[PDB]
Amino acid sequence: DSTECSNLLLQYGSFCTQLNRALTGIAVEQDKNTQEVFAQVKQIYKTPPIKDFGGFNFSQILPDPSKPSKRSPIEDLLFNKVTNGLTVLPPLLTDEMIAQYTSALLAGTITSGWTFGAGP
Amino acid sequence: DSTECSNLLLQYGSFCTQLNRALTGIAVEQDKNTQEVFAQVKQIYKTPP
Amino acid sequence: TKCTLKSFTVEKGIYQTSNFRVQPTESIVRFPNITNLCPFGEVFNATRFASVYAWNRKRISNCVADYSVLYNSASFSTFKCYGVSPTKLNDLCFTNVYADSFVIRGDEVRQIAPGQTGNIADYNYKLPDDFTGCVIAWNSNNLDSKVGGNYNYLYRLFRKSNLKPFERDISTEIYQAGSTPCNGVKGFNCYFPLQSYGFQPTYGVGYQPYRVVVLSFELLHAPATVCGPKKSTNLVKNKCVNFNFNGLTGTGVLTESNKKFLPFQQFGRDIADTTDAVRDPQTLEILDITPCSFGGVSVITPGTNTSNQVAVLYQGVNCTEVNVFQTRAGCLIGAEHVNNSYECDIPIGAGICASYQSIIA
Amino acid sequence: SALGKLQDVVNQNAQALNTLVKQLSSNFGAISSVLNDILSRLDPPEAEVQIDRLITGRLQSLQTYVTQQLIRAAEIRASANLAATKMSECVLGQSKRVD
Amino acid sequence: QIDRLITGRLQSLQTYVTQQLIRAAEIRASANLAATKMSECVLGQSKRVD
Amino acid sequence: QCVNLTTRTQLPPAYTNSFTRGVYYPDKVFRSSVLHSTQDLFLPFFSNVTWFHAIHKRFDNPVLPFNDGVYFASTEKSNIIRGWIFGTTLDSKTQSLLIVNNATNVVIKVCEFQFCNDPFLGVYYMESEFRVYSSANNCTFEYVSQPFLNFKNLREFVFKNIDGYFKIYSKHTPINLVRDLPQGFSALEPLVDLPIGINITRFQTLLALHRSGWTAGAAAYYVGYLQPRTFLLKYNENGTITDAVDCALDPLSE
Numbered sequence: 001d002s003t004e005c006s007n008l009l010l011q012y013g014s015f016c017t018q019l020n021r022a023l024t025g026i027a028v029e030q031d032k033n034t035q036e037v038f039a040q041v042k043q044i045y046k047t048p049p050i051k052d053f054g055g056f057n058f059s060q061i062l063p064d065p066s067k068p069s070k071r072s073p074i075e076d077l078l079f080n081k082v083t084n085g086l087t088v089l090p091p092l093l094t095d096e097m098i099a100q101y102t103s104a105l106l107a108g109t110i111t112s113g114w115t116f117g118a119g120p
Numbered sequence: 121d122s123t124e125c126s127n128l129l130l131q132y133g134s135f136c137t138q139l140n141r142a143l144t145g146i147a148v149e150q151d152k153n154t155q156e157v158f159a160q161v162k163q164i165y166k167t168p169p
Numbered sequence: 170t171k172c173t174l175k176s177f178t179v180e181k182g183i184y185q186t187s188n189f190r191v192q193p194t195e196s197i198v199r200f201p202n203i204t205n206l207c208p209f210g211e212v213f214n215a216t217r218f219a220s221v222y223a224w225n226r227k228r229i230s231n232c233v234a235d236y237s238v239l240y241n242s243a244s245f246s247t248f249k250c251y252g253v254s255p256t257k258l259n260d261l262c263f264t265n266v267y268a269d270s271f272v273i274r275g276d277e278v279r280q281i282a283p284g285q286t287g288n289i290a291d292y293n294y295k296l297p298d299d300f301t302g303c304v305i306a307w308n309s310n311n312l313d314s315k316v317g318g319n320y321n322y323l324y325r326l327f328r329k330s331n332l333k334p335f336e337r338d339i340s341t342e343i344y345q346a347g348s349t350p351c352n353g354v355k356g357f358n359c360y361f362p363l364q365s366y367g368f369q370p371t372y373g374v375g376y377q378p379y380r381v382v383v384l385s386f387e388l389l390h391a392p393a394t395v396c397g398p399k400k401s402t403n404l405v406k407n408k409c410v411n412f413n414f415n416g417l418t419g420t421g422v423l424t425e426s427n428k429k430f431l432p433f434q435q436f437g438r439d440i441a442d443t444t445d446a447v448r449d450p451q452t453l454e455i456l457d458i459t460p461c462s463f464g465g466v467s468v469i470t471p472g473t474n475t476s477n478q479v480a481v482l483y484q485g486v487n488c489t490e491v492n493v494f495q496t497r498a499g500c501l502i503g504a505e506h507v508n509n510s511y512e513c514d515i516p517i518g519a520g521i522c523a524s525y526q527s528i529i530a
Numbered sequence: 531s532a533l534g535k536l537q538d539v540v541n542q543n544a545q546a547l548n549t550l551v552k553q554l555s556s557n558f559g560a561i562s563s564v565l566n567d568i569l570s571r572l573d574p575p576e577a578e579v580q581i582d583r584l585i586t587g588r589l590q591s592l593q594t595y596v597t598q599q600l601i602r603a604a605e606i607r608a609s610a611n612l613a614a615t616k617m618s619e620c621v622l623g624q625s626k627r628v629d
Numbered sequence: 630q631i632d633r634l635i636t637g638r639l640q641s642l643q644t645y646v647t648q649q650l651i652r653a654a655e656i657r658a659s660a661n662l663a664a665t666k667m668s669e670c671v672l673g674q675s676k677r678v679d
Numbered sequence: 680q681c682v683n684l685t686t687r688t689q690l691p692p693a694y695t696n697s698f699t700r701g702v703y704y705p706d707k708v709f710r711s712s713v714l715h716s717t718q719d720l721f722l723p724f725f726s727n728v729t730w731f732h733a734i735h736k737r738f739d740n741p742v743l744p745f746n747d748g749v750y751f752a753s754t755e756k757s758n759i760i761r762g763w764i765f766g767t768t769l770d771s772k773t774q775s776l777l778i779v780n781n782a783t784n785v786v787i788k789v790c791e792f793q794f795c796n797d798p799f800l801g802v803y804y805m806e807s808e809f810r811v812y813s814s815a816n817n818c819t820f821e822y823v824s825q826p827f828l829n830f831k832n833l834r835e836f837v838f839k840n841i842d843g844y845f846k847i848y849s850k851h852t853p854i855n856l857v858r859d860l861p862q863g864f865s866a867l868e869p870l871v872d873l874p875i876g877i878n879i880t881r882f883q884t885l886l887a888l889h890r891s892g893w894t895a896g897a898a899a900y901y902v903g904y905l906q907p908r909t910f911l912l913k914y915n916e917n918g919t920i921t922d923a924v925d926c927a928l929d930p931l932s933e
């Protein structure tokens with residue numbers, strides 16, 4: 001909050017603008033990375049209510065209805081196992097929406113194989 | 121070996137720790153690179169005589 | 170946004186244009202409770218005072234000295250301070266205070282000063298030229314004068330040489346003004362050094378008795394501990410104020426704290442060595458210091474070809490500290506929140522997106 | 531140590547932020563690291579020099595932090611591009627690529 | 630004078646560390662490519678052209 | 680008044696292990712659930728701490744150096760140890776510090792005391808004997824406070840003199856160990872800060888005789904010396920230092 005310090009800081013030019021622009025580029029790049037990795041399907045696929053897959057069990061990777069976060073048991077375990085002018089911007093995609101994208105990908109690859117990745 | 125220089129250098133903080141940490145990260149990264157490229161088999165195979 | 174982007178046409182999107190700082194509103198200056206007053210009652214309100222020759226010296230240490238009680242009194246005729254001003258006495262701090270007390274005449278008060286001359290300065294009480302302190306004198310014709318004549322107050326009338334500063338001479342040896350030895354008898358040319366002032370109530374104002382207290386303030390290389398009392402501005406909570414607690418200053422919001430300090434601990438630090446907890450010196454309570462809200466100010470707009478309507482996002486700022494909607498990203502002003510879900514047009518954050526259809530979020 | 535790769539990124543980012551905050555406590559050759567102390571103790575001709583020393587030290591620290599942030603951003607971008615490639619080729623199809 | 634020497638040498642060391650990190654990123658990318666070639670060309674037959 | 684004690688038994692002073700004792704709070708700042716690294720005048724872990732006895736006939740009042748600071752440990756029962764003497768020459772030439780804890784209160788005085796060769800207090804079997812100094816001419820600082828104080832009580836004190844500030848740190852510990860220092864950790868709370876502003880290079884322990892000649896009550900004390908070093912302190916959720924690491928002791932702690 002020092003006015004004299006800011007007045008002396010203005011003598012150095014646009015260093016602050018460069019640093020803010022670089023941090024902004026990194027911040028938008030993280031969201032772009034999340035879009036590139038997880039948002040590869042424009043259809044939110046869902047599994048059938050009856051889990052008859054010829055003996056194959058996907059309960060550990062499909063979302064758990066009992067959990068409020070709608071995560072898989074594996075994803076829930078993964079989330080449990082990871083623990084002065086600075087601000088932290090929230091990610092554009094929240095964890096439940098990323099989990100929803102993974103659920104859509106899992107439903108597509110279980111019910112349709114590789115067909116959903118190449119078309120209908 | 122100058123004590124006065126080190127005393128003045130302590131005024132700048134943890135720059136030296138940052139540089140050492142970055143160099144250590146590079147040094148372990150080189151070994152990780154060599155492991156990733158060459159150590160892809162856990163069996164040492166040998167040709168027949 | 171046009172100013173930041175250096176263009177008169179703004180493409181559709183969100184642009185971080187400025188920053189918001191919750192400006193500080195009040196100043197809270199809390200120092201410790203006023204206790205341990207310095208014994209000024211035993212100097213000024215003494216039942217009897219000493220003579221100018223055997224002047225009483227009281228050393229005052231390790232207490233709180235309130236000088237405004239003396240300065241605002243109407244009972245003192247002289248309050249002449251040399252080397253320091255009376256207004257900053259109640260602020261400054263000194264290692265020791267020397268309170269010299271004696272009784273002199275009315276016309277002899279002017280001689281209690283640096284660089285003066287007279288019988289009192291040369292032979293009774295000498296002040297240094299480099300003197301820091303105050304000379305306080307008041308009339309005491311009511312107490313120190315009786316109708317028969319009060320001969321209990323004396324002054325040294327002679328001596329071979331002048332006194333050094335802050336010297337006391339209580340010797341009762343016969344002054345030798347001549348070449349002949351006195352031999353202890355007050356004969357020819359041999360007089361007695363101490364002479365009484367026959368203080369009578371009917372005297373003139375230049376001859377009436379005056380009680381003089383000289384306070385000497387010195388600074389030595391030891392840490393100064395006799396400090397004048399500081400005040401305590403009424404504590405204000407839940408607002409961004411500038412706090413000064415026992416010399417630790419800063420800006421923050423002071424809220425109630427659940428942290429139980431140990432009795433010897435006063436301030437609190439986190440991992441990053443920033444003061445986030447503090448103990449109030451007046452009332453022993455723990456206060457959390459939350460930093461004042463700061464945030465990026467972003468402008469959400471469609472193209473200027475389409476419309477000139479904008480919305481403002483204050484990042485990480487609650488809506489009560491700034492078509493107002495609260496998001497996890499921050500407070501969004503100018504966008505109408507709807508319950509429908511669409512594709513993301515302008516990204517806001519935390520799953521929130523904005524679009525133009527008015528501006529909706 | 532199964533999830534060390536994500537924890538490494540979290541630790542590096544938190545450590546970089548902690549170092550950047552910690553660098554404010556350094557005076558960088560000035561009499562004090564607190565701006566208020568310099569402004570209250572010295573006249574503006576020498577306080578300008580002390581503030582200038584603090585400004586150049588803090589600016590060097592911030593530029594250094596931004597530089598490693600950009601390098602780590604490049605590394606994370608490469609990892610994310612690899613992850614997107616694995617999502618496209620391993621999940622959305624069957625890959626003939628060995629390992 | 631020592632302060633001038635310290636700031637010059639510290640700037641030199643920071644510059645050296647900066648290009649070392651950039652070269653480390655380049656070598657890491659090359660090593661990842663080499664590991665991919667070892668996995669796909671040596672340990673199997675690759676249909677990828679060139 | 681001074682009295683020579685001529686009934687002592689000759690014995691060399693002992694030595695023992697410091698273990699992890701002598702840690703004090705370096706500042707007045709609350710810290711919770713954190714690990715804080717501080718560089719200050721500390722007593723090294725597992726150091727050679729000098730052991731002195733008071734038993735009957737041992738009465739250990741030697742002349743000890745002060746150096747940078749002094750850690751004073753006391754395995755005490757029945758209140759024999761009463762105070763300390765600090766100074767450079769311990770006479771009227773220089774200015775010396777007196778700390779005493781008699782039957783009523785704790786008195787700190789900074790005066791030019793002409794000290795006795797064997798300064799002591801006495802208990803008659805009531806306190807009616809005090810022979811520490813013969814004169815006191817120039818006194819600058821006085822401070823009267825509350826009483827600070829099988830072996831049942833452990834008294835730890837840390838005396839430091841930096842920048843004209845005399846820091847006294849204290850900790851009182853209930854123990855039931857018979858002869859030596861118990862092995863454990865206890866952080867010393869700051870007791871008092873005194874603006875004495877004097878040069879200190881030598882110090883004396885003040886004991887109390889028991890009279891019914893004289894008899895020395897069963898007591899034992901330990902003297903250790905502080906060195907400038909770094910410790911890693913652990914602060915729990917309640918702000919109490921519960922463990923410490925000497926950064927220069929061994930490579931594991933380093």
Ligand SMILES: *[C@@H]1O[C@H](CO)[C@@H](O[C@@H]2O[C@H](CO)[C@@H](O)[C@H](O)[C@H]2NC(C)=O)[C@H](O)[C@H]1NC(C)=O
Nearest residue numbers: 050051052053055056057058059060061064073
């Ligand atoms: C698929 O696998 C899950 C998990 O292994 C099975 O769920 C278990 O069912 C048994 C019997 O009801 C329970 O005792 C276990 O506690 C369940 N485990 C969990 C993690 O819930 C499930 O039965 C399997 N089969 C089907 C058809 O879903």
Ligand SMILES: *[C@@H]1O[C@H](CO)[C@@H](O[C@@H]2O[C@H](CO)[C@@H](O)[C@H](O)[C@H]2NC(C)=O)[C@H](O)[C@H]1NC(C)=O
Nearest residue numbers: 680681682683684685770794795796797798813
């Ligand atoms: C107690 O013993 C000490 C030590 O011998 C005495 O101190 C000596 O006093 C004589 C006085 O004639 C000096 O010449 C010595 O140099 C002193 N020695 C030391 C080591 O200080 C002390 O006087 C004795 N106490 C009494 C009351 O006699």
Ligand SMILES: *[C@@H]1O[C@H](CO)[C@@H](O)[C@H](O)[C@H]1NC(C)=O
Nearest residue numbers: 209210213214238239242244
């Ligand atoms: C001394 O006496 C006067 C007159 O009674 C009184 O106003 C004052 O409070 C007393 N104390 C001091 C410290 O002046």
Ligand SMILES: *[C@@H]1O[C@H](CO)[C@@H](O)[C@H](O)[C@H]1NC(C)=O
Nearest residue numbers: 201202203204450451452453
């Ligand atoms: C401070 O003084 C106030 C009254 O002015 C009193 O209520 C409070 O208990 C005091 N606090 C301490 C710590 O003495």
Ligand SMILES: *[C@@H]1O[C@H](CO)[C@@H](O)[C@H](O)[C@H]1NC(C)=O
Nearest residue numbers: 693694695696725726727728
């Ligand atoms: C302590 O010092 C004495 C001599 O001063 C020595 O004999 C003894 O072995 C030392 N103790 C340790 C543990 O080093």
Ligand SMILES: *[C@@H]1O[C@H](CO)[C@@H](O)[C@H](O)[C@H]1NC(C)=O
Nearest residue numbers: 779780781782783784786806
């Ligand atoms: C303790 O010492 C103080 C200061 O010298 C004295 O006033 C007090 O009477 C002493 N008490 C006893 C029991 O000797």
Ligand SMILES: *[C@@H]1O[C@H](CO)[C@@H](O)[C@H](O)[C@H]1NC(C)=O
Nearest residue numbers: 771772791815816817818819
């Ligand atoms: C200390 O005491 C001696 C003798 O009483 C005296 O001559 C000397 O001036 C005193 N010094 C101070 C600083 O009071």
Ligand SMILES: *[C@@H]1O[C@H](CO)[C@@H](O)[C@H](O)[C@H]1NC(C)=O
Nearest residue numbers: 766767768773877878879880
């Ligand atoms: C303190 O005393 C010692 C020995 O008497 C001397 O070597 C040292 O220079 C003195 N220090 C000061 C600051 O007077």
Ligand SMILES: *[C@@H]1O[C@H](CO)[C@@H](O)[C@H](O)[C@H]1NC(C)=O
Nearest residue numbers: 429914915916917918919921
């Ligand atoms: C901290 O204090 C609480 C009571 O407030 C107690 O239950 C807890 O056990 C304490 N923790 C430690 C490590 O002593």
